[PDB]
Amino acid sequence: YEGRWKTVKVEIEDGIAFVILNRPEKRNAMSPTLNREMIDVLETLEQDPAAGVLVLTGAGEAWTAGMDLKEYFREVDAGPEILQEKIRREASQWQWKLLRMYAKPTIAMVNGWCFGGGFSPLVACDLAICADEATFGLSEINWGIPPGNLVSKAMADTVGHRQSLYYIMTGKTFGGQKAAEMGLVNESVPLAQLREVTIELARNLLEKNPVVLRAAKHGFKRCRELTWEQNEDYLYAKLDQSRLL
Amino acid sequence: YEGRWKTVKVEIEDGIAFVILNRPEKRNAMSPTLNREMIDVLETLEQDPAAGVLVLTGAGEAWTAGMDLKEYFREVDAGPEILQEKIRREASQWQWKLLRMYAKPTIAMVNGWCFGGGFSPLVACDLAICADEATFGLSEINWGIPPGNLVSKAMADTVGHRQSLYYIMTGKTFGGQKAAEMGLVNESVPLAQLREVTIELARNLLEKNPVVLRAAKHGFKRCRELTWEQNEDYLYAKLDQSRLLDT
Amino acid sequence: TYEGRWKTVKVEIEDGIAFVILNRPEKRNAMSPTLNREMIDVLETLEQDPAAGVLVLTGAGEAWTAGMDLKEYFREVDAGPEILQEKIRREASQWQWKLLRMYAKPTIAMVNGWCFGGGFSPLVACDLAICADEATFGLSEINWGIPPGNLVSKAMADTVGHRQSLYYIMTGKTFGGQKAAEMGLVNESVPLAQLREVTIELARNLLEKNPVVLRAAKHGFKRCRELTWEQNEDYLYAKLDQSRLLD
């Protein structure tokens, strides 16, 4: 994978695939090029037997600053109305359509700035660990747009109703400890311990049977959407499907 | 707005409209008259450009003691059966039908007693700050009625499952700090600073583009009800709708 | 009369409080197909017993319940025809949540010790829960190479945050009573020495309520989480009116 993508790096060791957003000069802002490369990364890693767990993280200071505004407006304005359809679909494709129900377990390792559009893949990742020193913010409101793509849903799934509305409406920033207290991530630790803690967690997930872990994590995310009576059928079907596979 | 309504007061100061429930002798219990006047207040303020943020509060020691089921069972019992349908519709109309998806940002400023039916507008308001000294309760059950109107849903949206069932089933009261801990409100502060803290927040909200703020807060409340694939469609529609309406 | 009535469960009723005691303590009250059929009979019987006003579900010995008796499950399943599995899963759901979640009487889980795996379904079906600080919880399924079966994942979804649920489901790590309470899985964790007293105090409070009203309030809350505000205007007023009919 060395040198394979312009805007993303993948480094695999001991079954742990670190997927590293790599536009550090622009705080790993997600451009249309980054979106297309991330789809290719996820599809490729899915079928790579050396990858048992994915860890999503950022190069340099940022996790991701969110959408690349220049690069989106560059691409979008250079085409017909229908190019916007494609650009938005590419963003969704890696950020959650492939990632939320990904076949392998996924951990967001939030090393620094996590803003705006970054909240979609943050929550699509199964588990998340951040640095205390990381800063989070839904600044869209201060830029004059509401949260785009699945950002508001990412917050609804993880953070309480009052707290989500406060951060969305005010655009105020919050650090790692607060992110963990609100439920946006699993834990926050000093940046110096972030990689070690994340790796200990990844190792734990690697000890599980991947088909069973997949049934468990997909079953949980989907059951939130279903009634108890629906889930009787659905959750036993997931159990039987795991026994088959 | 001086003297315009019997049971409510509106005072606007510098973009912030304080809407003050004003039956302090009855702890601001929500009578059919108050429900009709509150509809009129919300519809009026929606169209008044002087009002950029609405703060809902109570006169005197209460925020609101809940429904005036007294006056309710007065009008109902001495009227035709179908009168009840009108009274209940009027209650929902201001308490959440208009309020939950209100075009302007809203803050509940809970200065004291908040019981029973008051939970519906409390949660319909986008944000909420209460006094530590405030007392909350779903005392419904101790009077032999389950929570009426949208009260149980207001709890479901903001407070966890176990804690909601505890308060609904026991009817036990709790204070402002507990309300903040449970997630029913955003923050609890001493009554002496309640107004300052509320005004600070309202100023933050007043500075945002109102059409964009409306898209953000409505989109969030709605997206709770929809799957991620539904929301891809809905949230991008709200984003595009915001662009159109802002311009 | 309940002495010696059931092999795997005991029922002891005093002062309106029916303690339902899972009783296979040598197998840490693992839930076998016999126990599931007995628990169906227990719940149907207690429903119509005028001496029982509130049910408290608890375990004999050190355990609350270690979960599905998978040995006894697979033993019979491997033995008999394919459809036997349908009956065993039906009987497990029947008591664990189909009867229990919307049970006509108030229910409290009193979690005295180990609560693993399949235990989580009745744990969350019970309206309220109090556990001992010493109790250990875990979703050990994943380490036994199966995902959570029956309604366990929904039980966690209803009561514990998205990240925390995924963490315990995916890792299979155990946690104690204080953590269960912090996470929202139960209402409160206290020392085992105080567990019965605290549970009885709560049960007494629930017994002071009109049962029909309590049933309306508790069912209404559980169901309202699934409905939109507009749907709930209809549904919750219908529960209010139904309560007023039934008395």
Added chain:
Amino acid sequence: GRWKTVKVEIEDGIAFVILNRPEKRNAMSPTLNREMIDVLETLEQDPAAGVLVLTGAGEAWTAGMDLKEYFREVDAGPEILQEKIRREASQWQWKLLRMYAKPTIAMVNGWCFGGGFSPLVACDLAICADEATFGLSEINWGIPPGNLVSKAMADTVGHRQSLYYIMTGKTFGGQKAAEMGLVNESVPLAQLREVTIELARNLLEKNPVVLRAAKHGFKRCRELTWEQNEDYLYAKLDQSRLLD
């Protein structure tokens, strides 16, 4: 003489509510919307009205939204005015009407286009004239179905037929509206009133509160699973017993 744009003629418990801008094919202006809110709130509490029949003056039922009038009011003001105008349209067209306390019958005497679909389907039952023409012309005017039109189609007309009429904007007659399930029955115009009154009288026989429970219960049950409906529908049954 109470309303500019609507007439109400009550006769033997049957309240005919007549959209009355025949020069404009009873196009639904913001004025008409505001008056229709007052009509429904007023008739709800009028003991003399047992069933509502919604119909139109002149040749039309309704040609749908009055775009001229709408823009008129909308261009005269700030963005927030549009929020109010859209709320007023929904308030009578379905928010009050779909779950109205009394039974409602749409009596579709003629042209029914566009925005007219929402109150058409909000009314419990509908009888149209064979001679009546229906259409979702929105698409031919460069807008998608606004307000609740698409949902009104979804509730009553099959997936393929709905998408066909929405996408093409093709017109269809009364017999076709009945075949597709948009209305209950289509009859020649000469018999329309007589058939509608017979139905209305049948409805007037029933206990109003029981009928309300039945009507509302059905509409709502479509949205709920079987397990949810066990709870909800018995609650409606018990509420009906209480209210009489």
Added chain:
Amino acid sequence: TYEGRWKTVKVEIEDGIAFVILNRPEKRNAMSPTLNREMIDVLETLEQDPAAGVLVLTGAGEAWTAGMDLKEYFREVDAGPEILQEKIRREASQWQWKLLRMYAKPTIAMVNGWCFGGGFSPLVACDLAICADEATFGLSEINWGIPPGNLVSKAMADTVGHRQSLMYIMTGKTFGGQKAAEMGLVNESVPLAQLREVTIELARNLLEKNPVVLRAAKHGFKRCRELTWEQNEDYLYAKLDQSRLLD
């Protein structure tokens, strides 16, 4: 033998076809609390009976069922404790649709005559239905001052168009078998003289199929109506893999 096992129902198996015959012909097979309890036992028993591959539900005498036995129901509810109403409603739902709608074996309603009111719930819970042209249907509840109880309105929602459902629910008018088939309430209407033959042909067709596969298919279809396309991708492939595992 099932001969004389139940007071209000008979069961007879013809090489894999279990005919289940509501048997109170003097009452047009009105469904009493006893009948509900016996049907629960029947369905449970037949589920586990390897001699039974398809169930055919039909009525003794002239009727299929005239619906709820209101007289007997009111008798028992009036004389019993308040909570007896809960039990009775639970037992009616238990066989009518909770067990029957997602039954492990294929089910066919063979509607030989009168089908009113409450009989619509098990009519629609049965997978397929064939009726006699001479049969009469109605929801004449409304004429006796009762809206449709139990799952009647949902059974109509699932099978009959919106306008037609409302018409019959609101007017209480009867319709015959051919109109029942035209509206989608049943699959087919045939002269009563050919009813048993046509039903047997259908049942023996279903007996060709692998039972586990047929169960996956029919349950999958009924459930998928409640789910979005994206949810169904997950759900329907899980039912396919579950079918593979279990046969």
Added chain:
Amino acid sequence: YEGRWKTVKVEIEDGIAFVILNRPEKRNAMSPTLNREMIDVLETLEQDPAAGVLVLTGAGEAWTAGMDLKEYFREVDAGPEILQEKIRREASQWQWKLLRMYAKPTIAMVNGWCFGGGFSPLVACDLAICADEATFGLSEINWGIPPGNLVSKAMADTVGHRQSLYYIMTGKTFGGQKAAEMGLVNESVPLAQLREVTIELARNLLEKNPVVLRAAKHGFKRCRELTWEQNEDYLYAKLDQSRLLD
């Protein structure tokens, strides 16, 4: 587009892109390769201004006989466990994930055999017109398979509850007139008139503003899933969004 793909052809005439499943010797059975090519086809045509409406049809006798189960099992048997995830994803990607909410109008022109897995793209297409002579079936069940992918939901969306269970449970076949009567397609005409009738419809759709038509048809499909109150919000948002992008 000549010769661009192995299993599919695309021929555009005056705004109408005919997308032709092209494995006639296997009655256009949908193999993993065909799935991948259809994804590329759909993504390509979405961005091609020359294509205003898509018509999905089959080469030879069949529309599609359904999933190529032989090829599917060969690949799943030989590949790693996780390959089954990918193959299933790719099937869904073109059959309905891209297709059901496609940016352009779509019409299924069902010229012949339509079985099993075929039902998903048939219903994902906005409209559908079939030949009277066409034969449809969910004969999965006779092979010991319940309907896979979205087939059961495609049925639920278009055909009534009873008729759907009947055909799913029995595996019996039905022809084009019956398909139209049940609501599975919009219309059935003799095969000799099928193309003409399809083209006339496609031309009508080409008259419309593409962005408005997209808002209309997407709004309809999505509104079936939402309550009236939810739809007040959603459908007005789709209206406003259309006026923006128009």
